[PDB]
Point group: C3
Chain length 53, copies 3
């Protein structure tokens, strides 16, 4: 394990572990516990072609 979720998902401004903000889904994430980044999107968008596309 040389890579962590820090290079794919980053903790949101408030809902990085709560899953919600102010009672509603955070503008960046919605109950995920972080947010997607350039790498995460590449590793997700690419897999979205062989998994969901």
């Amino acid at each position: 394990m040389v890579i962590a979720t820090d290079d794919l998902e980053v903790a949101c401004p408030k809902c990085e572990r709560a899953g919600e903000i102010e009672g509603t889904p955070c503008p960046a994430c919605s109950g995920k516990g972080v947010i997607l980044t350039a790498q995460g999107y590449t590793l997700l968008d690419f897999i979205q072609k062989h998994l969901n596309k």
Copy 2:
């Protein structure tokens, strides 16, 4: 982001942005916008076990 789609998907010989060739899907890709490589297959084939397998 320290990694790009270049280490997973490479532009096809002709259909790297068109998604098709001569009205027909490229022998390597079929409207994807690139092609899969050894790394892409490992990162896709491995996820195909926890997503599609």
Copy 3:
């Protein structure tokens, strides 16, 4: 390809190529042909949010 399945999945104690043990799947992995690791889980668990979650 600069990465292999060795940084995501490793051969199990017995069912790394058999896919089964004593007539039953390995306690650590099922007829998969290996086992999940910390990296594989991160690359799978993260994709499990954009693919299965």
